[PDB]
Design a protein around this ligand. Sequence first.
Ligand code: NA
Length: 244
Amino acid sequence: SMITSIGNPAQVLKVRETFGTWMRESANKSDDRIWVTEHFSGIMVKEFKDLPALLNSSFTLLHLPHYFHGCGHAVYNNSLYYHKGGSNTIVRFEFGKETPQTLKLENALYFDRKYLFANSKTYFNIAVDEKGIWIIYASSVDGSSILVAQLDERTFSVTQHINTTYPKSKAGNAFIARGILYVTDTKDTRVTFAFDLLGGKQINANFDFRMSQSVLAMLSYNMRDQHLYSWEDGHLMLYPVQFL
Ligand code: NA
């Protein structure tokens, strides 16, 4: 099924950090924790035990095995998925463990400011939804096309590279819900492109995302509550979504 509209947002918090990510578990689990990264690069993640903890800036610091770049990470099943800064390596870091798993996206743009999403200086966007685990990236072959790697969860390996043919120059940002890729306009306020990942075909999508045009750092669908999570100019937002 497809998204027909996005509701008014709920703001959870405003921080000084213009760019960052906030993330919650999306696996069918009782887990109230929140994970945050700040800025476009670093080696630390802040873990909050719950929302009141986030509200009061009471966090545990977790040191990562590799520096992250960008704002396109995701948390799924007690693991952080993220772009290893300055490489085409994607890292899966399980929070109670030492050695992460890694995979390489050999034909993906990953340096020299040739971003997948320029607004957020992002090269890769990891997304988790009802139909699988996905890595959105931009081709280093033609330097333009948006692709989505479909993952195998157990092996943390790529089973398929899906070419949308959509040029990244038209994309503001994106998220994936129920196996459908949704891409925003360059102003990041409307969704103007969509792609049925398992059907391998474009589908019509034109609906408003938000009224604010403030810079958009992170945009991510969480299948556990079916809400859009975003980070907008230091504002942590939640959007409800309406399916057809
Ligand atoms: Na996104």
